[PDB]
């Protein structure tokens, strides 16, 4: 989520062991570290371009992605830097030889590199426990919106 400021904490935000010697006059000021998390997900240039710190960024942080790769429609974007998707699925009741709609709300951390709004389909990746509940991380946005700029005013 973030946006603005970047240095808006009591603590000074920075990447661990990414030194910039002030002696050596530079044109970019702060050297930045990023990675390619693998598994075929482009690390959006807005991770490389950006300035946000986020130690839970799968591209500019110390989290690593491995295990389950899931997708769900974004259903809530109200928590700073983490959203809550709703993965739905039909479940088989064998006495009746029919299915019923269930669902789950997996809470996942989202890196500033992505901007997400509610409704977007997302693709998440499992990582270490990052909080009390989040065990996944936003790793690709699939949708865009919902054809929103084609819902405008009059002729």
């Amino acid at each position: 989520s973030t946006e603005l400021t970047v240095q808006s904490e009591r603590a000074f935000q920075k990447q661990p062991h990414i030194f910039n010697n002030p002696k050596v006059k530079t044109s970019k000021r702060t050297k930045r570290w990023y990675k390619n998390a693998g598994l075929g997900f482009k690390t959006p240039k807005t991770a490389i371009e950006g300035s946000y710190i986020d130690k839970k960024c799968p591209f500019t942080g110390l989290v690593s992605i491995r295990g389950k790769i899931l997708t769900g429609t974004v259903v809530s974007t109200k928590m700073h830097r983490t959203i809550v998707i709703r993965r739905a699925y039909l479940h088989y009741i064998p006495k009746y030889n029919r299915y019923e709609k269930r669902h789950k709300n997996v809470p996942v951390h989202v890196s500033p590199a992505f901007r997400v709004q509610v409704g977007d389909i997302v693709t998440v990746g499992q990582c270490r426990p990052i909080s009390k509940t989040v065990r996944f991380n936003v790793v690709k946005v699939s949708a865009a919106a919902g054809k929103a700029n084609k819902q405008f005013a009059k002729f």
Partner: protein
């Protein structure tokens, strides 16, 4: 004692979870070192599977790194000036990681002048060689030359004294020193 389990703690739904089994020694936790200044005093602590941990309580010197200079010295820790987590740490001069402290300066003086031959603030043979081999590399920095006047340099604790019994850190600089500076005074 303390238990780092999560099996208390309401469920994300908010439900109250029952008691299932008693506290296990491996999900335990111990108390804080609340390490402070002065007179070295440390207590080893038997952790899981052999393995000592070293609880510092009272430390007075520590190893500190001039980052843009690639050296290190141990110096007296003058005390604490800032702490992002808790103000009471600053007031009790408690040493923890990410603490902001002041250190003895002079050993970083003694080195600099003996390495650059320039003296901060305000004649041998091959010595002259070296001192003149360097510089154009001696420029230091406005706000880091400054602190030397006071004989007290600002440095961030990087070690975890509660764990290692060490109290090590790096002198503040650049963008980072700029941060704590602004903070330090617009509250002073």
């Amino acid at each position: 004692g303390i238990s780092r389990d999560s099996r208390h703690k309401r469920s994300a739904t908010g439900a109250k979870r029952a008691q299932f089994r008693k506290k296990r020694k491996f999900e335990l936790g111990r108390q804080p070192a609340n390490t402070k200044i002065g007179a070295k005093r440390i207590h080893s602590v038997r952790t899981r599977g052999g393995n000592k941990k070293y609880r510092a309580l009272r430390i007075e010197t520590g190893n500190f790194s001039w980052a843009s200079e690639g050296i290190s010295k141990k110096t007296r820790i003058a005390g604490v000036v800032y702490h992002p987590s808790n103000n009471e740490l600053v007031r009790t001069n408690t040493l923890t990681k990410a603490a902001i402290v002041q250190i003895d300066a002079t050993p970083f003086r003694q080195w600099f002048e003996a390495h650059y031959g320039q003296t901060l603030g305000k004649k041998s043979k091959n010595a002259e060689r070296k001192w003149a081999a360097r510089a154009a590399s001696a420029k230091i920095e406005s706000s880091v030359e400054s602190q030397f006047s006071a004989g007290r340099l600002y440095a961030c604790i990087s070690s975890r004294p509660g764990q290692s019994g060490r109290c090590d850190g790096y002198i503040l600089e650049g963008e980072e020193l700029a941060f704590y500076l602004r903070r330090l005074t617009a509250k002073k």
